[PDB]
Amino acid sequence: VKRFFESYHEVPDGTQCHRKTYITTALGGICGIIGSAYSVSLNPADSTLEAVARVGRYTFTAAAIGAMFGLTTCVSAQVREKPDDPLNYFIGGCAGGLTLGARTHSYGTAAMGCVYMGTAAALFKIGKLEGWELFPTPKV
Amino acid sequence: PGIVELPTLEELKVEEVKVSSAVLKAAAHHYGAQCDKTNKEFMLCRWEEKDPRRCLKEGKLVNGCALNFFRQIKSHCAEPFTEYWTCLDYSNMQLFRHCRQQQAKFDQCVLDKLGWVRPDLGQLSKVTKVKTDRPLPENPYHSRARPEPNPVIEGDLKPAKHGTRFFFWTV
Amino acid sequence: MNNYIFVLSSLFLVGCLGLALKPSPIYGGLGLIVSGFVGCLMVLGFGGSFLGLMVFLIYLGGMLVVFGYTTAMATEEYPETWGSNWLILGFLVLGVIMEVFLICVLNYYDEVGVINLDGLGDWLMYEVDDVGVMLEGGIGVAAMYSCATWMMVVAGWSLFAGIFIIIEITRD
Amino acid sequence: MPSTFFNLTMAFSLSLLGTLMFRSHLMSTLLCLEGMVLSLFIMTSVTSLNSNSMSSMPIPITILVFAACEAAVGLALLVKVSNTYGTDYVQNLNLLQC
Amino acid sequence: MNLYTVIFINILLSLTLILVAFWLPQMNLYSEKANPYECGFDPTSSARLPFSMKFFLVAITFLLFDLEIALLLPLPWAIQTIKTSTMMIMAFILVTILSLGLAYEWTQKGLEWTE
Amino acid sequence: PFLDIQKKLGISLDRHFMFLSAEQPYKNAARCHAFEKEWIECAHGIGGTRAKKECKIEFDDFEECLLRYKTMRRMHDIKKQREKLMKEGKYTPPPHHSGREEPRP
Amino acid sequence: MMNGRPGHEPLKFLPDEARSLPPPKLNDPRLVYMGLLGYCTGLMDNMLRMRPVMRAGLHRQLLFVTSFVFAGYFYLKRQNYLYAVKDHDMFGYIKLHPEDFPEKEKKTYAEILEPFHPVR
Amino acid sequence: MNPITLAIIYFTIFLGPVITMSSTNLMLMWVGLEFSLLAIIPMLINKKNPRSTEAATKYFVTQATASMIILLAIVLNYKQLGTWMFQQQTNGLILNMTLMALSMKLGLAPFHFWLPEVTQGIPLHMGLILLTWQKIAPLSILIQIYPLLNSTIILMLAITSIFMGAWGGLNQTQMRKIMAYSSIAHMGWMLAILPYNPSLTLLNLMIYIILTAPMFMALMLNNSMTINSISLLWNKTPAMLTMISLMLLSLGGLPPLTGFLPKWIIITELMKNNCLIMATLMAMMALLNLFFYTRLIYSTSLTMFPTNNNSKMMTHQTKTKPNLMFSTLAIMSTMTLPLAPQLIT
What we know:
The structure is cut from a larger assembly and holds eight protein chains of eight kinds.
Chain B: H1 9-12, H2 21-26, H3 28-34, H4 36-48, H5 56-76, H6 79-90, H7 100-112
Helix pairs in contact in B: 4-5, 6-7
Chain F: H1 5-9, H2 33-43, H3 49-54, H4 56-67, H5 69-88
Chain H: H1 3-22, H2 26-44, H3 50-81, H4 92-106, H5 114-119, H6 124-133, H7 137-144, H8 151-171, H9 175-193, H10 198-222, H11 227-231, H12 241-252, H13 260-272, H14 276-302, H15 311-316, H16 326-334, H17 340-343
Helix pairs in contact in H: 1-2, 1-7, 2-3, 3-4, 4-7, 6-10, 8-9, 8-14, 9-10, 9-13, 10-12, 10-13, 10-16, 12-14, 12-16, 13-14
PDB class: electron transport
Entry title: Closed Complex I from murine brain
Chain A: NADH dehydrogenase [ubiquinone] 1 alpha subcomplex subunit 11
């Protein structure tokens, strides 16, 4: 899946919106599966049916966040013709936070998720633009 | 990598002894004392040159001297050696302690004829210093270039310039 | 007679699978006794017999004390062997099927060469000194008395300190 | 030898999964620990015998000694647990969360 | 191969004996016959209750002494060593500390079957 | 960290059995003594990154001796070709490889 | 990172090359501050044991100040050795590899055209 | 107790990490870890209460599982290379298993769950011995394999330990659990700086040890277990308050206390290695750590919680505080920032 997440960046922004949305939805689904596994391990449900329901709810929530993020980011890059711009990623991250708030049924969670996830996505876009090395190999 | 070279069947052919382990152990002491020069030459070449493919002549010489030793044994006196090695062959460990009488008769044979003396208790188990003319292999193990170490820095230990140079600390 | 060690290793895998599947500790000790005997046979097949017999004797004593303790305190009215839940049996046969599937996959994928069906039993013992005395296992364990006295003294201090430790834990 | 070593590594993995997945029995957890120990002993012995490392042959004896020491300590702790409660249940010993 | 054949022959002999014992005689099975024995009365408990052994410290000490046995067992090959002085000293130290542990446990009443 | 009381005091508690080519009990070897000796003599004095770079030949030879992956693959290829030729009928094994050979001591 | 250097004798507090370096002047701010810390340690100990803060335990305060100055002096000499040998190794490496550290020529402020940003 | 077994147990507690840090064989490092675990268990279960028994059981099974994974890594390395040390060309899987198992030995997140549980229900001096002395031998093994570590896994473990430690210490009101979450956060910092500089994780370990030794000593003086128990310290030992507040601020990393120095120099080295994202996140969660320290300071020093009647008898009686250990470590852990070039090595 390393080649999958690299194939996210093989095309510039505003191109292959379906591919970018699918890749981001898959990434969100993986993250939701991991979080649901931790949740059902640390805090066990009353039965296996409730455990499976919680896993599905968390996975669908994170998949919806990733799908709306990728879709809104690619749509913004389409509608204004400058792909290398962090405000598209900020708008997409805010849409993902609004999706989180809609799933959680709380406008306060929607607003906080919008601001925090938009800031995170804009920082990520700036990092991919200007070569910020997350987890760098020791050099000095 | 490279093609490994190894000798052919023609140069691996030799007159094998075809002699059982019990008769070998019965004749072991006198064989070890008769031609120890040839055997020690073979062991010296074998431990100096780790390649078995460059000691074949020494191995054939070991086989030749062993064959000559057994031909001398067969020619001069054969039946007390025969009864001695069969008495050794009887036991499950070929223990020398069982049939010392036949050992004494065989030693009497090889002392009256050919003048052989059986080695003592601790004589066959020491170093030998065998003389040879084969040149000493200057590069065993086929070692590589052994790359040179790091260029160690020499000089007088001056103090650190302008102190520790850690932010605003002057000293 | 070539795949004897492979059959033993598969039996060891099955015994460890049962021990992982966690029966009542009576049957857990049974599975560990069987696995210890099988591992002893594997060590004996690979070489010296002293290490295999040592681990066999040690695990016999260990599982005996374990049996005493699970009779004393780690017991219940209906100690489940393996068939109290059908999930345990289904998971055992599922693990067996997965073992067969993975070894078939690694035989089909013969590039690395970890498990080969045609090459099994060909690379068990690599090189042995054909003529030679005092080259079996147990000579090194004896060399612990002369060449690794640090290993000997840390093991002895571990047992001594362990006596003090267990007395102070169960002092009550 | 590589097939047997793969089997021994998988046996250690199974015993580790048994140690990590609890089923109501501290004694069964200790049993899984000693299964891991036995797998490591067999791996070390087979490796030393294959490589003819007679100098490293005291290593399995050392790991056996220290493993039996830790099994001794675990049995003593299980005795204390049984004296505290009377059932030896890992879910029953849970009162340190607050 | 020989030892394997003898082991399998003994196992097959024991299996043959118990199969003869189970398929030879006549069976008449009912509930009062196959009930647990309990000296002619119904058992009060289920015979699977906790037993509470009284020599648990002796059992743990047996584990430690069995591993001390495993340490002491390569002595017949250890006495063939070329040094023999460090070997003798090491064997003396090992036996002495084992005896010291036994003496300390005896003094602290470890092997006394606390009820 | 790593204290060096063994190097400071000059003793060797656990340093004579660090690797295979080191002080076997009577006089024995460890099946890759020459290869491990060559690798260690290469890597000594330049240790770390330089030893990883320019002792790769010696390390590859030693790893091949110890693990024998290439010999296993070569022997498997030879046996696979032999079995293919047996199936196709184009090969008959010699008497010494298959069956009765002339035994030499 | 400097433990593997050639000539590194293990667990040696002050090798003889440290004898080539000038020692601390025994009244320098590091050692005066160490003595001050020892004095404050004595005062805090008296206050915690609920004694008079300075009227009591004069021998204890003297021992505290003396031990702090003593240990600080020897540790300071060791750190001076470490910084000096770090500078020595760096300069030696610079001299050993001159092609990786070129003496870059800077030009005057008559050829370079710095852009001008007006602040209207 | 008994002086003979006290000497045996404490000597083995000392001997474990000493063997681990002074032995060049991975097997002898493992037997040192085993020595430390088996020796420290009877010191844990000593009061013979259910909480002590539970803490000893949890600690035993956790450290036994982690040591078994360590021994698996050692045996696999011995199979791969024939040596008893990870030299340079071992398998990354072996190295990652070593790192994971040593992280579970150390107790940093997401392997951190047992550490506040074990620290709770255990007497304060044993908590001190655990949280300081038990974290040197696994750190010694980690420092020994200073290169050939996965920086990605290192940074993930470091960031999650700092995050979870900050959140846990923020929630907790029990003093021992607070100290355990502080341990988790500082271990996260040490592990973060581990693959780039062993000197800086050694420095942070020393600063943490000399900072949390007198914190535990001050808890041990009045046997104060909770926030309220440390809050009625103005009536019990009013001279303690300034040093308690300064050491809590130093644990928070506030300048000009010397606890600012490890975070400052670790951030400096990570800037030198271009890990600004990790460094910034670590610094913000360190601010969270400082928040729960400051709430503790508000409880114990800057306000005066109500006291009860029997504290009059407590003031009537007399006390005893260890010389040469509390005041020395408190001063060296608060007022040693201007000796920073001497502290870094």
